Coordinates of C-alpha atoms in Angstrom, one line a residue:
Chain A
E1 CA 131.0 70.2 164.6
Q2 CA 130.0 73.8 165.1
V3 CA 132.1 75.0 162.3
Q4 CA 130.5 72.4 160.0
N5 CA 127.1 73.8 161.0
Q6 CA 128.4 77.3 160.2
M7 CA 129.6 76.3 156.8
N8 CA 126.2 74.8 156.0
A9 CA 124.9 78.4 156.2
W10 CA 127.9 80.2 154.7
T11 CA 127.6 78.0 151.6
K12 CA 123.9 78.8 151.4
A13 CA 124.7 82.5 151.5
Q14 CA 127.3 82.0 148.7
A15 CA 124.9 80.1 146.5
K16 CA 122.4 82.9 146.9
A17 CA 125.1 85.3 145.8
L18 CA 125.9 83.2 142.7
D19 CA 122.2 83.2 142.0
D20 CA 121.8 87.0 141.7
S21 CA 125.0 87.3 139.5
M22 CA 124.1 84.4 137.2
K23 CA 120.7 86.0 136.7
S24 CA 122.4 89.3 135.7
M25 CA 124.4 87.4 133.1
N26 CA 121.5 85.4 131.8
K27 CA 119.8 88.6 131.1
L28 CA 122.6 90.0 129.0
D29 CA 122.9 86.7 127.2
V30 CA 119.2 86.8 126.3
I31 CA 119.3 90.4 125.3
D32 CA 122.3 89.7 123.0
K33 CA 120.3 86.8 121.5
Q34 CA 117.4 89.1 120.9
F35 CA 119.6 91.7 119.2
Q36 CA 121.1 89.0 117.0
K37 CA 117.8 87.5 116.0
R38 CA 116.7 91.1 115.1
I39 CA 119.9 91.8 113.1
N40 CA 120.0 88.6 111.1
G41 CA 116.6 89.4 109.8
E42 CA 113.9 88.2 112.1
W43 CA 110.9 90.1 113.6
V44 CA 111.2 89.9 117.4
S45 CA 111.1 93.0 119.6
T46 CA 114.2 94.2 121.4
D47 CA 112.6 96.4 124.1
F48 CA 113.6 95.2 127.6
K49 CA 110.0 94.7 128.4
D50 CA 109.6 92.0 125.7
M51 CA 112.4 89.6 126.4
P52 CA 111.5 86.1 127.6
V53 CA 111.5 85.2 131.3
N54 CA 112.2 81.7 132.7
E55 CA 113.1 82.0 136.4
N56 CA 116.8 82.0 135.4
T57 CA 116.4 85.6 134.4
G58 CA 113.6 87.2 136.4
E59 CA 111.9 90.4 135.3
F60 CA 114.0 92.7 133.1
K61 CA 114.8 96.1 134.5
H62 CA 115.8 99.0 132.4
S63 CA 119.4 99.0 133.7
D64 CA 119.9 95.5 132.3
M65 CA 119.9 97.1 128.8
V66 CA 122.1 100.1 129.6
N67 CA 124.6 97.5 131.0
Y68 CA 124.3 95.6 127.8
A69 CA 124.4 98.7 125.6
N70 CA 127.7 99.9 127.2
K71 CA 129.1 96.3 126.8
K72 CA 128.6 95.7 123.1
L73 CA 130.1 99.1 122.3
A74 CA 132.9 98.2 124.7
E75 CA 133.4 94.9 122.9
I76 CA 133.2 96.4 119.4
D77 CA 135.8 99.0 120.3
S78 CA 138.1 96.1 121.2
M79 CA 138.5 94.2 117.9
Chain B
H1 CA 124.2 73.9 148.5
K2 CA 123.3 73.5 144.9
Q3 CA 122.9 76.7 142.8
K4 CA 119.2 76.9 141.8
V5 CA 119.9 79.0 138.6
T6 CA 120.8 77.2 135.4
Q7 CA 122.6 78.6 132.4
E8 CA 119.6 77.4 130.4
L9 CA 118.0 80.4 128.7
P10 CA 114.5 81.2 127.6
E11 CA 113.7 81.2 123.9
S12 CA 111.6 83.7 121.8
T13 CA 110.8 83.2 118.2
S14 CA 110.2 85.5 115.3
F15 CA 106.8 86.1 113.8
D16 CA 107.9 84.8 110.5
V17 CA 104.8 84.4 108.3
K18 CA 105.2 84.0 104.6
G19 CA 102.2 84.6 102.4
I20 CA 102.3 84.9 98.6
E21 CA 104.9 86.8 96.7
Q22 CA 103.8 89.6 94.3
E23 CA 104.1 89.7 90.5
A24 CA 106.9 91.9 89.3
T25 CA 106.2 95.3 87.6
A26 CA 104.7 94.2 84.4
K27 CA 106.0 96.0 81.4
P28 CA 104.4 99.3 80.3
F29 CA 101.8 98.9 77.6
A30 CA 104.0 101.0 75.3
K31 CA 107.1 98.9 75.8
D32 CA 104.9 95.8 75.6
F33 CA 103.7 96.7 72.1
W34 CA 107.3 97.6 71.2
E35 CA 109.2 94.4 71.8
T36 CA 106.2 92.4 70.5
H37 CA 105.3 94.2 67.3
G38 CA 108.6 96.0 66.6
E39 CA 107.1 99.4 66.3
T40 CA 105.8 101.9 68.8
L41 CA 102.1 102.9 69.3
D42 CA 102.4 106.1 67.3
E43 CA 103.8 104.2 64.3
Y44 CA 100.9 101.7 64.5
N45 CA 98.1 104.3 64.4
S46 CA 99.5 106.1 61.4
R47 CA 98.1 103.4 59.2

């Protein structure tokens, strides 16, 4: 009944680690959706400072576009 | 503990405003006279 009390905290520290790595995937998904709405012929900006933000993503940093930019090119190279 | 981060994503929409389309490039007055009176402008003033 001490190890149970330890797991109540270790699980909280694992859910706070799948919160900061699902944010960093939400941001790439929304950046892809922005690029795709811009390509298919719709007038919405694609700067990282103009994405939408909904507490599943947080504020967008610059490095969350670099990451995306090297990941479309990586995916297009593999087709 | 439940993960307080949902795969639900935010949504932005395009500023898609459609006004009124333009009329195409109306024919030049020389060609207008041509395919309506069968003869060019020079050939009409020689009379």
